Amino acid sequence: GPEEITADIPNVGEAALSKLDESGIVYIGAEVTGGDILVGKVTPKGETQL
Amino acid sequence: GVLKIVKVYLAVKRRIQPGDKMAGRHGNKGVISKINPIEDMPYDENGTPV
Amino acid sequence: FLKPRLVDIEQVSSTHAKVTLEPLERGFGHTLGNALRRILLSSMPGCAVTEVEIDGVLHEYSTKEGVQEDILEILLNLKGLAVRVQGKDEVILTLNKSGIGPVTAADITHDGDVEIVKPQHVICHLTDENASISMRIKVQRGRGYVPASTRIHSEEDERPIGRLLVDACYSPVERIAYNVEAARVEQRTDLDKLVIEMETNGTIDPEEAIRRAATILAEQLEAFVDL
Amino acid sequence: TEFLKPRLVDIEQVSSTHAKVTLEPLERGFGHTLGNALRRILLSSMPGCA
C-alpha cells in the first residue's frame, strides 16, 4: 500500500506528537533535539503474524 | 514510486569542543585538548589572560 | 599573626577601579591576590538576559522586515546589556520603539529596580518610518557561564517558539590584576600592600564584590578546619 | 546563587609522620585556589621551634 504522511503514529505519546501540527510536520521554528519526530510517516505492513 | 517528499532544514549551532582541528596559516595543525577556565590562564602584569 | 583590613577604594571610571588592602605580612600579598583573583574572575553574582520573546520572530535565524540587524545578531547584543536588580531574581522587561533611528538601551521600560548602566548601548537600528519592534526581555540572575545549550533539558514545555533563548553571561568581572607593593607603616619591620586593579561592566560595586568573594573563601574553609 | 560544600574526606595514614587526605566536591578551579593557598602558608608561615 501507499505510505501516509499522516500525523497518526502508533505508539507515541502526546509529548511526541506535540511538536507536530495537525498534518504531521514539525512547526517552523520549533527547536528539536535527538529523537524528536520531524515528519510523521507510516507504511502499510499487513498480517503481522504474532 | 514516490508519492510525496518532505524536506526539513535544521540549523544546528555548534561552538567548539575537544577534538576539533585547528590551524594557523603557517601549517601548524592542532586538536583542542582541554577547555581551561579563565582563572588558570597565564596572565600578564596588567591582568589580561591569554 | 597581624590581620589585614581594607583602605581607600578609588573609583576611576564606571567600568573599573583600584581597591587596596593595607596590612599584609610577608608574602601574604601574593597568597591572597592570587586566591582572590581566582574567585573574582570566576564565581560572582550577575544578571544576564536569558529568554527573549520578540514580535513576529519564529526563530533566531530570520530577519525582521525594517531592521538591518539579523535576529541572531540582535540576540548577541542583548547578551552584552548590563543591568542590575535589587529584590527580584527574575524580571521581564518590555522594550518598545519605532521610527527611523537607533534603538538604544534607554528606550526600555523603567522599573523600580531597573538601573541601566549604559543607556547608549546599541540594541539595533531601525530603518523605516513606520516599523515597530516589541520584545519581552526576561532577565534573571545567577553565577558562572550557562550556555543556551545546557538549558534545554528541564524544558518541560517551553512551547513559546517565539521565546528564543540566549547564552548566560553571568559575571561582572572583565579583567582582574593584583600588584603587591611594599607598604611602609610608620613602625613595623616590613609590611606589604595589595593593589587589586579590576575591570567591570559597572553592575557591581567594588566593596560589595570583594566581600562576597572572600565570603565564599572562608565558607569553603569551613569543612577544612576539621575532618 | 547557592554554593557547593565538600563531602567525604577519608584520611589514609602513611605511618605516623605523613598522610594523603582527599576532598571530593570542589567546584571549578577551587581545587587550585584552595590547594595552592594552603600549600603557600604551610611551607612558609607556620609556628616552629628549630
Q: How far is B22 from chain A, CA to nearest CA, in Å?
A: 27
Resolution of the determined structure in angstroms stands at 3.9
Q: Decide if B12 touches A, using CB distance below 8 A.
A: no
Instruction: List b or e across C70-100, with b for residues whose CB sees 16 or more CB atoms inside 10 angstroms.
Output: ebbebbebbeebbbbbeeeeebebebebbee
B contacts of D33 (beta carbons < 8 Å): 39
Nearest to C166 by CA among C58, C70, C51: C51
C contacts of A18 (beta carbons < 8 Å): 157, 159
Q: Please check whether residues C69 and C142 belong to one and the same domain.
A: yes
Distance CA(D15)–CA(C215), nearest Å, equals 37
Structural domain harbouring C207: 1-45+171-227
Q: In residues, how long is chain B?
A: 50
Check if the beta carbon of residue A42 is closer than 8 Å to that of residue A4: yes
| Residue listed under C-alpha cell 578609588 | C10
Final residue belonging to a domain, choices C170, C189, C211 = C170
- How deeply is C211 buried, as exposed, middle or buried, from its count of CB atoms within 10 A (0-12, 13-18, 19+)? exposed
Q: How was this structure determined?
A: X-ray
Q: Please check whether residues C117 and C51 belong to one and the same domain.
A: yes
3 state SS of D13 = strand
Q: For CA atoms C167, C171, C175, C177, give the dihedral sign.
A: negative
Q: Please check whether residues C160 and C92 belong to one and the same domain.
A: yes
Distance CA(C94)–CA(C71), nearest Å, equals 17
| Residue listed under C-alpha cell 565570603 | C215
Residue C181 cell numbers, joined: 607593593
Residue A15 cell numbers, joined: 509529548
Alpha-carbon distances of C214 from C13, C42, C98, rounded to whole Å = 24, 13, 46
* DSSP alpha helix (H) spans, D1-50: 30-43
Final residue belonging to a domain, choices C170, C191, C217 = C170
Contact D28 C34 (CB under 8 A): no
- How deeply is C20 buried, as exposed, middle or buried, from its count of CB atoms within 10 A (0-12, 13-18, 19+)? middle
Question: Least CA distance to B37: which residue of chain D?
Answer: D29
| Residue listed under C-alpha cell 595552592 | D36
Partner residue facing C59 (CB), from A18, A29, A33: A29
Final residue belonging to a domain, choices C131, C147, C170 = C170
Cα atoms found within 13 Å of the Cα of residue B33, Cβ hemisphere only: 2
Nearest to C73 by CA among C82, C63, C86, C65: C63
Q: How far is D42 from chain C, CA to nearest CA, in Å?
A: 11
Check if the beta carbon of residue D41 is closer than 8 Å to that of residue C24: no
Q: Please check whether residues C85 and C152 belong to one and the same domain.
A: yes
Q: In residues, how long is chain D?
A: 50
User: How many other CB atoms are there within 10 angstroms of residue A16's CB atom?
Assistant: 14
Distance CA(D5)–CA(C223), nearest Å, equals 8
Q: Please check whether residues C19 and C50 belong to one and the same domain.
A: no
DSSP string, C68-91: SS-HHHHHHHHHT--EE-SS-SEE
Question: Least CA distance to A30: which residue of chain C?
Answer: C161
Distance CA(C15)–CA(C41), nearest Å, equals 15
Contact A38 B4 (CB under 8 A): no
> Which of 18-47 (A) contact C at CB < 8 A?
18, 27-31, 33
Check if the beta carbon of residue C140 is closer than 8 Å to that of residue C85: no
The conformation of residue D16, written as its DSSP 8-state character, comes to T
> Which of 19-48 (B) contact D at CB < 8 A?
37, 39-40
Q: Please check whether residues C156 and C212 belong to one and the same domain.
A: no
Question: Least CA distance to D39: which residue of chain C?
Answer: C31
Q: Please check whether residues C93 and C197 belong to one and the same domain.
A: no
Question: How many domains does chain C fold into?
Answer: 2
Residue C123 Ramachandran class (φ > 0 left, ψ -120 to 50 alpha, else beta) = alpha
Q: Where do breaks (C to N over 2.5 Å) occur in chain D, by preceding residue number?
A: none
Q: Please check whether residues C125 and C161 belong to one and the same domain.
A: yes
Check if the beta carbon of residue C81 is closer than 8 Å to that of residue C46: no
Q: Decide if B38 touches A, using CB distance below 8 A.
A: no
Q: How far is D14 from chain C, CA to nearest CA, in Å?
A: 17
Q: How far is B35 from chain C, CA to nearest CA, in Å?
A: 13
DSSP string, C142-172: EES-B-HHHHTTT-S----TTEEE--B---S
H helix count then E strand count, chain D: 1, 2
Q: Please check whether residues C70 and C81 belong to one and the same domain.
A: yes
Nearest to C164 by CA among C48, C80, C69, C51: C51
Q: Please check whether residues C58 and C133 belong to one and the same domain.
A: yes
Distance CA(D33)–CA(C77), nearest Å, equals 33
Which candidate in D21, D22, D24, D30 is best for mutational testing of the C interface (most C CBs within 10 A)? D30
Give the type of residue at C105: A
Please report, for the domain that includes residue C212, its CATH number.
Answer: 3.30.1360.10
Number of cross-chain residue pairs from B and C with Cβ atoms under 8 Å apart: 27
DSSP string, C32-73: HHHHHHHHHHSS-EEEEEEEEEESS-SSTTS--TT-SS-HHH
Q: In residues, how long is chain C?
A: 227
Question: Least CA distance to A27: which residue of chain B?
Answer: B8
Distance CA(C23)–CA(C221), nearest Å, equals 22
Q: Please check whether residues C75 and C144 belong to one and the same domain.
A: yes
Please report, for the domain that includes residue C72, its CATH number.
Answer: 2.170.120.12
Q: Please check whether residues C73 and C95 belong to one and the same domain.
A: yes
- CA–chain centroid gap for D32, Å, is 10
User: How many other CB atoms are there within 10 angstroms of residue C124's CB atom?
Assistant: 20
Report the run of H or E that residue C212 belongs to, with start and end: helix C206-224
CA angle C67, C163, C93 (to 5 degrees): 75
